Design an enzyme around this catalytic site. Structure first.
Site, mmCIF file in Angstrom:
data_model
loop_
_atom_site.group_PDB
_atom_site.id
_atom_site.type_symbol
_atom_site.label_atom_id
_atom_site.label_comp_id
_atom_site.label_asym_id
_atom_site.label_seq_id
_atom_site.Cartn_x
_atom_site.Cartn_y
_atom_site.Cartn_z
ATOM 1 N N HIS A 1 72.263 40.696 26.395
ATOM 2 C CA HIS A 1 73.107 40.680 27.385
ATOM 3 C C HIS A 1 72.725 39.885 28.554
ATOM 4 O O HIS A 1 73.061 39.883 29.610
ATOM 5 C CB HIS A 1 73.257 42.055 28.192
ATOM 6 C CG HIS A 1 72.234 42.844 28.840
ATOM 7 N ND1 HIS A 1 71.181 43.633 28.353
ATOM 8 C CD2 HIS A 1 71.964 42.483 30.004
ATOM 9 C CE1 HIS A 1 70.321 44.059 29.260
ATOM 10 N NE2 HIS A 1 70.693 43.394 30.248
ATOM 11 N N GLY B 1 66.240 44.520 36.887
ATOM 12 C CA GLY B 1 65.296 43.375 36.415
ATOM 13 C C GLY B 1 64.166 43.730 35.474
ATOM 14 O O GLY B 1 63.478 42.593 34.908
ATOM 15 N N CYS C 1 65.001 44.734 32.258
ATOM 16 C CA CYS C 1 65.153 44.517 30.982
ATOM 17 C C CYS C 1 64.393 43.477 30.305
ATOM 18 O O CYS C 1 63.907 42.496 30.838
ATOM 19 C CB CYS C 1 66.614 44.185 30.793
ATOM 20 S SG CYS C 1 67.677 45.474 31.226
HETATM 21 O O1 3X5 Z 1 67.653 44.635 33.888
HETATM 22 C C1 3X5 Z 1 67.605 46.065 33.907
HETATM 23 C C2 3X5 Z 1 68.714 46.917 33.866
HETATM 24 C C3 3X5 Z 1 68.205 48.185 33.108
HETATM 25 C C4 3X5 Z 1 67.661 48.804 34.035
HETATM 26 C C5 3X5 Z 1 68.003 49.260 35.385
HETATM 27 N N1 3X5 Z 1 67.014 50.330 35.857
HETATM 28 C C6 3X5 Z 1 66.409 50.538 34.843
HETATM 29 N N2 3X5 Z 1 66.536 49.848 33.801
HETATM 30 N N3 3X5 Z 1 69.709 45.958 33.140
HETATM 31 C C7 3X5 Z 1 70.837 46.825 32.884
HETATM 32 C C8 3X5 Z 1 72.200 45.944 33.123
HETATM 33 C C9 3X5 Z 1 72.624 45.705 31.426
HETATM 34 C C10 3X5 Z 1 72.877 47.208 30.789
HETATM 35 C C11 3X5 Z 1 73.267 46.704 29.293
HETATM 36 C C12 3X5 Z 1 73.730 48.093 28.691
HETATM 37 C C13 3X5 Z 1 74.987 48.941 29.503
HETATM 38 C C14 3X5 Z 1 74.622 49.045 30.843
HETATM 39 C C15 3X5 Z 1 74.051 47.930 31.415
HETATM 40 C C16 3X5 Z 1 73.684 47.975 33.199
HETATM 41 N N4 3X5 Z 1 73.658 46.681 33.659
HETATM 42 C C17 3X5 Z 1 74.030 46.029 34.518
HETATM 43 O O2 3X5 Z 1 74.142 44.934 34.644
HETATM 44 C C18 3X5 Z 1 74.792 46.797 35.439
HETATM 45 C C19 3X5 Z 1 74.266 47.143 36.949
HETATM 46 C C20 3X5 Z 1 75.052 47.704 38.014
HETATM 47 C C21 3X5 Z 1 76.252 48.558 37.419
HETATM 48 C C22 3X5 Z 1 77.016 49.405 38.247
HETATM 49 C C23 3X5 Z 1 76.694 49.167 39.810
HETATM 50 C C24 3X5 Z 1 77.214 50.025 40.588
HETATM 51 C C25 3X5 Z 1 78.237 50.789 40.359
HETATM 52 C C26 3X5 Z 1 78.607 50.867 38.756
HETATM 53 C C27 3X5 Z 1 77.720 50.374 37.913
HETATM 54 C C28 3X5 Z 1 76.442 48.478 36.146
HETATM 55 C C29 3X5 Z 1 76.100 47.626 35.229
#
Ligand code: 3X5
Length: 306
Positions: A41, A143, A145
């Site tokens: 991702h 961050g 991941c």
């Molecule tokens: O890089 C670290 C994070 C994981 C993590 C964060 N805190 C603890 N662990 N990566 C999460 C990424 C990728 C991941 C892939 C599987 C499905 C969920 C996603 C979530 N990630 C996002 O990029 C993400 C960040 C914020 C939101 C979000 C923000 C505000 C409101 C709703 C959603 C949605 C996705």
């Protein structure tokens, strides 16, 4: 004496962490030999994550769409392929700090150490178990991941987890290092939730044996139980059923302490029915389930205190 949650020394893993950047997403990867492993991702923006198609997202990247940093050194990507939920990037240099290692898919109840990393830079280490619902109670920020989990035997690192995502309850999910998720989770930002969890029975017993090895016996009793009457009680308290294979696993600890595993199951059954009466075990007021039998033998004296 004493008993603490204890992680493996993290040096061998620290020498494998790198930073991986694709466009505006940056996360951690794991550099063994001439490959760098990371969550696939990293090729996604926030918006892509609602409904990504990874195959189609990836054919659109080149080798130079990926930037890999190792300290101050830029590593040059010469190859990339997708493996389930990971990318493997081939780089022009072989990690000289690569340790002897193997990849393993750990099984619910097992424990491992996690090196929390940000921007390829290791910031902490802690121990956690794979829950029965295939999550872990990690401590992770945005961050993190690509941060990995591992066990070390002799000189060989057994990598068993890569961090991909955090769930609404604040638990963490991820994959082994061949990219296959633990549990029913996918790397899509779509409503997903931890299934109900269970207490890991094998571990509780293992930890009661710990308490006896140190020298504490207050929670024992004169009773024994059948395996089956144990389970009627176990289910009622949301403990995993004990199986004969779990009984065999406890043999060595049973033998070091002269307490028969069923006799320990009767000890536990009574703990579940009566509480702990405001007493503690190995310093805890509550029954602990994230130490395996192997964790107890590794940490405890081979000589029982009495
Ligand atoms: O890089 C670290 C994070 C994981 C993590 C964060 N805190 C603890 N662990 N990566 C999460 C990424 C990728 C991941 C892939 C599987 C499905 C969920 C996603 C979530 N990630 C996002 O990029 C993400 C960040 C914020 C939101 C979000 C923000 C505000 C409101 C709703 C959603 C949605 C996705």
């Amino acid at each position: 004496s004493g008993f603490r949650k204890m992680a493996f020394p993290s040096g061998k893993v620290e020498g494998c962490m790198v930073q991986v950047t694709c466009g505006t997403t940056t996360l951690n990867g794991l550099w063994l030999d001439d490959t760098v492993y990371c969550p696939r991702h990293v090729i996604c923006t926030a918006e892509d994550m609602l409904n990504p198609n990874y195959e189609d997202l990836l054919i659109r990247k080149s080798n130079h769409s990926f930037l890999v940093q190792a300290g101050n050194v830029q590593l040059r990507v010469i190859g990339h392929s997708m493996q389930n939920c990971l990318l493997r990037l081939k780089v022009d240099t072989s990690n000289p700090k690569t340790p002897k290692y193997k990849f393993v898919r750990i099984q619910p109840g097992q424990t491992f150490s996690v090196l929390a990393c940000y921007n390829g830079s290791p910031s902490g280490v802690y121990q956690c178990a794979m829950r029965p619902n295939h999550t872990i109670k990690g401590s992770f920020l945005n961050g993190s991941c690509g941060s990995v989990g591992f066990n070390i035997d002799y000189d060989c690192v057994s990598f068993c987890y890569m961090h991909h995502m955090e769930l609404p309850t604040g638990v963490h999910a991820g994959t082994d290092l061949e990219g296959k998720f633990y549990g029913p989770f996918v790397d899509i930002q779509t409503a997903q939730a931890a299934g109900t969890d269970t207490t890991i029975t094998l571990n509780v017993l293992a930890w009661l044996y710990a308490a006896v090895i140190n020298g504490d016996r207050w929670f024992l009793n004169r009773f024994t139980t059948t395996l089956n009457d144990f389970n009627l009680v176990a289910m009622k308290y949301n403990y995993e059923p004990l199986t004969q294979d779990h009984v065999d696993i406890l043999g060595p600890l049973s033998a070091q302490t002269g307490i028969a595993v069923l006799d320990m199951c009767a000890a536990l059954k009574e703990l579940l029915q009566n509480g702990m009466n405001g007493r503690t075990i190995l310093g805890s007021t509550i029954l602990e389930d994230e130490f395996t039998p192997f964790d107890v033998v590794r940490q405890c004296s081979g000589v029982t205190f009495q």
